Structure formats: C-alpha cells, structure tokens
C-alpha cells in the first residue's frame, strides 16, 4: 500500500490567516496515464468527508477560491489562504494512483488564542465505588491553551501508567480552550496498598508542574 | 444534485452479519463506479470495496476480503455491501461513495453519503455506576464519574440544567468492554456547599436516572 503522511497532526491558526498542510506519499503518485491522482478532503464534525481538491490542484464544485493545492512526485501541499470559521475541521489527503486507494491520518485545523494555564482538581474514589470493589482517582485539567499537556500520576512518589484513561474535550466554542479528564482506576485492594495520590501536569504556561495530591488516610 | 443515502447499520454480535444498502440519485447510476469506505472513531477513512459501473470489476481491501461482498443493481439505483464474520475491528461509520471518471479510469471518490453506523460488540446493555466527585479557592470544581455502561447514550444534567455554562462533558471511552465518561462543574465557593449541587445521569437504553448529591467530605 501507499502510505500517506500528513504534517502537522494538529494545526492552530488565527482566523484570517493562512494555513498550510503537507502530505507525503511513500511512492510516486504519477500514474502511467500522466495524471497525479492526489486529492484533499475536508471532514467536519458529524459529517462525511467532502472533496476539496482533486488531481493536486483542481477545486471541486463549490469549493471557494481560498483553497489551493500544489506539489509533485511525492510531496504535496494544500493552502487555505484566509482561514474562516467554516474551514475548521479535519483535512485528509488521499491517493488514487495505486490500488488500494489510501488516506492520510488527518490534520485537525483549530483555533489560536492566548495561552491559558489549566485549572487542576483531584478527586479520591467515592465510598460507593470502594463498596463495589474499585477505586478511581479522577483529575480534571480544565480551560487551558495550547492543547499540548502531559499528565503524570504518582502513587507514593512513584509514577504509574497502568489504569490511566485520558479524555479530551474538543476546542471550546466560546473561549477556544481545551479541557481534559485523567482517571486512574485501581482495584480497592491496590488503592489500599498506597497512601499518596498525585495528579501532576506540565503545560507550556509554566516550567513548574502543577501538582495536586491527597493522602488516602486523610 | 448528487445524493447517496446508506442504510443497514446496527449493533451485532461478533460473528454476526449485515447487509448495507446505498440509494443513489441525481446522476445516471449505471455510468459510475461506486465504493464503500469505513471510518472508526478518531481515524482517517479506509477504503473497503469497489465495484465498476457495469460490475465487471470488483476489488476489496485486504482487511475485508473473504468476508464482505459488494454488489449493485443498476435498475434500482442501489449499491450493496453484505458483511459476515464481523469482528469488533469492523466497527465504524460506513460510507457509500461515488467514483468519478473522465475516460477509462475511476480516479476520485467525489460524492459520499452521511454514512451508516455498524458496531460489533458482545456487550450487554448495562446501566452506569454514578460516582460523586467532591473535594476531599474562590471557585470550586465538582464532578460525576459515569462508569461501566453500554451503549453510549448518557446525559449528565447539573441542578436541573440551570448550571450549564460552567460544565465540561468529557467524551466516553471504552474499557473492560464498557463506556466511561465524566462531567465537571465549577461554581463559586459561596454557592457550594452553601447551596445544593446535584448531577442527574440519564441512561435511556437501560431506562435509568441517577441523581447524585455532591456532599463535602
């Protein structure tokens, strides 16, 4: 198969600015008939992909002037010259020169705003869940920007990764921030082997991690 | 205008089957090759199968061949996908898509339907466990953890909906075969625990509502 490699995975842009997305194929996309069958699609939330550009640079019917594609051989670029709110979504490149036709991993076009440090809140398991025999430690990291953030769980000062499930909201439609939920799920027995529970967050808004902790016997 | 509308999705057990249809209008159906394309949550699209306009050529992705059969009936303007021996990795939105051509090559999928959803799981319908999240600062953040349910539809409501702008609903995630999500709310310390704050969790498929009062620890 032909592997389509898109960069960036995520692309923050200011409205009215220019966005650029690149696509790289693992083989030449020049068909023996001479065409280059490289296409771009745009997918909005809850909808199917819509074709924007076909054969490198042809705008599909009803696609506005601000979408432009170029490139050759294995290296391709899609330009959106003056991003508007309707252009936010996931863009994919695709090739149809070889069987099977394949798709890139996607590039999410997203909104730029000023930095914002997360608000971090940690929560112990409920008595009700412990009665059920499980123990979830929850940490909310709310209303931050940019989306990049690393959460570490520490149990008694030591890192743990087994049992952690992380969930991200989409970009908020009113303040353009992101939020995240980090849940560490143990059995009651594992929960009862340890006492210090820590949610730790590094975000570009500080060199210092944001540390949130509780002690189980308190 | 070109229109494609697929149907036949649903939830099936592993090893079950499906026959998807796609109804086409606004173009001479028998002039165009057609394809099926699927897309799992978070993933790009993945081509599944293709059938030429008069059905002389049929091709299949490696991930489906043997198990799926694509067909068309030009006089009914309908494309078909029979799927068997379904596995959880077949869970996806399934799209019908038209291939355009200018000469001898079907070269681009130009019109796509809204998709029909196929879920392949052995999960039983299971009501969620609703756990209060209270702190055990001018503003205070509370939560409810909604753990171990199936299928996906739940709704979390805070104080009968009056609290709404300070709410974050986090997307559900599969684990141990079931879904889990959480919701957070942020109120002023003046309001809680001075006043009451309650999360209402509706799970329609299991016909359950759980109201959990947030009590300071």
């Amino acid at each position: 198969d032909v592997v389509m490699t898109q960069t960036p995975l995520s692309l923050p842009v200011s409205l009215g600015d220019q966005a650029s997305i690149s696509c790289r194929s693992s083989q030449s996309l020049v068909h023996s008939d001479g065409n280059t069958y490289l296409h771009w699609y745009l997918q909005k939330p809850g909808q199917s992909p819509k074709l924007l550009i076909y054969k490198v640079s042809n705008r599909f019917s009803g696609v506005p002037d601000r979408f432009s594609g170029s490139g050759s051989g294995t290296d391709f670029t899609l330009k959106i010259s003056r991003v508007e709110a309707e252009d936010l979504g996931v863009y994919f490149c695709s090739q149809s020169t070889h069987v099977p036709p394949t798709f890139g991993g996607g590039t999410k076009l997203e909104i730029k705003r000023a930095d914002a440090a997360p608000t971090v809140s940690i929560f112990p398991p409920s008595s009700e869940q412990l009665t059920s025999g499980g123990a979830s430690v929850v940490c909310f990291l709310n209303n931050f920007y940019p989306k990049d953030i690393n959460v570490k769980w520490k149990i008694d000062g030591s890192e743990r990764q087994n049992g952690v499930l992380n969930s991200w909201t989409d970009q908020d439609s009113k303040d353009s921030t992101y939020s995240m939920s980090s849940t560490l799920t143990l059995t009651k027995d594992e929960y009862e082997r340890h006492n210090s529970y820590t949610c730790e967050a590094t975000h570009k808004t500080s060199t210092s991690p944001i540390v949130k902790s509780f002690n189980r016997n308190e | 205008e070109v229109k494609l509308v697929e149907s036949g999705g649903g939830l099936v057990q592993p090893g079950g089957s499906r026959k998807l249809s796609c109804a086409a209008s606004g173009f001479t159906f028998s002039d165009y090759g057609m394809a099926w394309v699927r897309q799992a949550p978070g993933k790009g699209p993945e081509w599944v199968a293709f059938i030429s306009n008069l059905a002389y050529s049929i091709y299949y992705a490696d991930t489906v061949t043997g198990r799926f059969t694509i067909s068309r009936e030009n006089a009914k303007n309908t494309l078909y996908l029979e799927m068997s021996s379904l596995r959880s990795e077949d869970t996806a939105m399934y799209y019908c898509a038209r291939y355009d051509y200018d000469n001898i090559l079907d070269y681009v999928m130009d019109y796509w339907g809204q998709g029909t959803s196929v879920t392949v799981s052995s999960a039983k319908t299971t009501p969620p466990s609703v756990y209060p999240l209270a702190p055990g600062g001018s503003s205070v953040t509370l939560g409810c953890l909604v753990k171990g349910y199936f299928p996906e539809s739940v709704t979390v409501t805070w104080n009968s909906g009056s609290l709404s702008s300070s709410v974050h609903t986090f997307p559900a995630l599969l684990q141990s075969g079931l879904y889990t999500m959480s919701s957070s709310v942020t109120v002023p310390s003046s309001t809680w625990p001075s006043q009451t704050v309650t999360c209402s969790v509706a799970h329609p498929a299991s016909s359950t509502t759980v109201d959990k009062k947030l009590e300071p620890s």
């Binding site: 149809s96 020169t97 036709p101 | 090759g33 059905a55 050529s57 291939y99 000469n103 001898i104 090559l105």
Partner: peptide
C-alpha cells in the same frame, strides 16, 4: 485507480 466499464 480502477477500470471503468465503457
């Protein structure tokens, strides 16, 4: 990439 039926 597929062959059309003329």
């Amino acid at each position: 990439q597929f062959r059309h039926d003329s």
